[PDB]
């Protein structure tokens, strides 16, 4: 479930395969993130690794500070546009896909997160929960 994650993670519908671009929801200067790998991904012939909300990915910055560019860094997915089932009994989705830059322990590089953060990701990652202003 990733190093720095808090506990187990139940299955969520996948929305971000490799090659997707999500927004950057933190304040570290990045504008978007390009997914190149997914942590904890399984292996199966022809199957693209994909990420859901609360997953850790390896991402590059395509738009933003040149200091942030040309570097591959961990990011944590805090919003997705693909609908997913909550166990309380509703399917739900956000407007956009969004992630935040972290280190391998899952600590936030930036100081705040703009916009809502999915409850599943916030509950999985304590530092995201500490930097979140809106938890859905």
């Amino acid at each position: 479930s990733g190093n720095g994650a808090q506990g187990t993670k139940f299955r969520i519908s996948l929305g971000l395969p490799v090659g997707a671009i999500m927004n950057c929801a933190d304040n570290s200067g990045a504008r978007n993130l390009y997914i190149i790998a997914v942590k904890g991904s399984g292996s199966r012939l022809n199957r693209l690794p994909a990420a859901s909300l609360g997953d850790m990915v390896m991402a590059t910055v395509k738009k933003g500070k040149p200091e942030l560019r040309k570097k591959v860094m961990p990011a944590i997915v805090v919003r997705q546009a693909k609908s997913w089932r909550r166990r309380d009994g509703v399917f739900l989705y956000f407007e956009d896909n969004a992630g935040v830059i972290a280190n391998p322990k899952g600590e936030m590089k930036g100081s705040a997160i703009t916009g809502p953060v999915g409850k599943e990701c916030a509950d999985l990652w304590p530092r995201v929960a500490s930097n979140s202003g809106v938890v859905v």
Binding site: A81, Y93, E95, D96
Partner: protein
Amino acid sequence: MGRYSVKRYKTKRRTRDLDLIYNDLSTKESVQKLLNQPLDETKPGLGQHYCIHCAKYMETAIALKTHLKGKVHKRRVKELRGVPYTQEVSDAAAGYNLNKFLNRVQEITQSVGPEKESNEALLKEHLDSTL
């Protein structure tokens, strides 16, 4: 379901909501902030020439003027005339939070509405003067 509706109103191609635009127009400070924006490289027209009603950037002032002279803009202006339809309306139509909805309607009719109307009048005459 059909291709036209799917590719126009796909979630990744969503537009700003009408209650949010109503709140944008209600206060003078929001109006001035949206009228006078910093030079942003990634918006059309360097972030200038922004129509608040349609939440839309135009490339040029002449484009904004031709847009204001249009049935599309007038359609949006007509849409923003009434109560902005929060979840409170649906709750009250179900018969729930009725007093809250009635208080909100009274506040719109007494304070928030006429102030929004005055701001819209001032905004329209400023656009007429500068365009």
